[PDB]
Amino acid sequence: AKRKVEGDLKLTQEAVADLERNKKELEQTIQRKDKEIASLTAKLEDEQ
Amino acid sequence: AKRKVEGDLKLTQEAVADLERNKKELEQTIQRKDKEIASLTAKLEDEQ
């Protein structure tokens, strides 16, 4: 049994490294959509 | 040796779930911003 518990822990850890892979593939979208509105919501009121 | 590792899974599962609860809000803020940028590209073009 201890083996099963350890296996579950390993699987949960696998989910977390991947959860680093999610959180950095998403934070790039945070910065990219930040610079787009910093381009657009600057230029929209100017073209207003 | 089994006993302390059983608690370590309880530690690591919620730390996974905390990022997994941070996973859905991080999509949610992008889903909050997925719509307006595709909207303002029309609005900037309609005013232009």
Side-chain angles (χ1 to χ4, degrees):
Chain A
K2 203 167 178 183
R3 304 179 178 186
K4 299 181 179 180
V5 149
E6 273 180 1
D8 296 1
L9 297 188
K10 272 183 178 181
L11 274 281
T12 56
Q13 285 148 341
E14 172 283 336
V16 323
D18 189 38
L19 295 201
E20 189 271 336
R21 203 261 322 163
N22 291 319
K23 77 176 182 181
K24 299 290 103 177
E25 86 186 308
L26 198 144
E27 69 96 12
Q28 47 91 10
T29 318
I30 293 172
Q31 277 82 240
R32 165 174 68 254
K33 297 306 196 91
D34 194 328
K35 77 192 161 33
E36 190 156 336
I37 59 170
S39 72
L40 267 78
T41 51
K43 76 164 54 56
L44 179 49
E45 47 92 10
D46 303 328
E47 289 149 77
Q48 162 66 26
Chain B
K2 172 180 73 66
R3 181 159 297 269
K4 65 99 173 179
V5 176
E6 287 165 276
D8 274 358
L9 180 73
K10 167 266 181 173
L11 170 66
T12 306
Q13 276 267 107
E14 53 85 20
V16 160
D18 276 352
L19 211 155
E20 189 64 30
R21 90 175 68 187
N22 280 119
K23 165 69 163 57
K24 293 288 103 179
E25 54 87 16
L26 269 183
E27 199 272 339
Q28 169 216 50
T29 308
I30 289 300
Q31 196 35 67
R32 193 252 192 191
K33 260 150 61 185
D34 272 317
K35 44 178 177 284
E36 51 167 18
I37 292 168
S39 85
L40 280 202
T41 303
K43 178 178 178 293
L44 176 85
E45 210 76 18
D46 294 358
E47 196 147 73
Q48 205 78 351

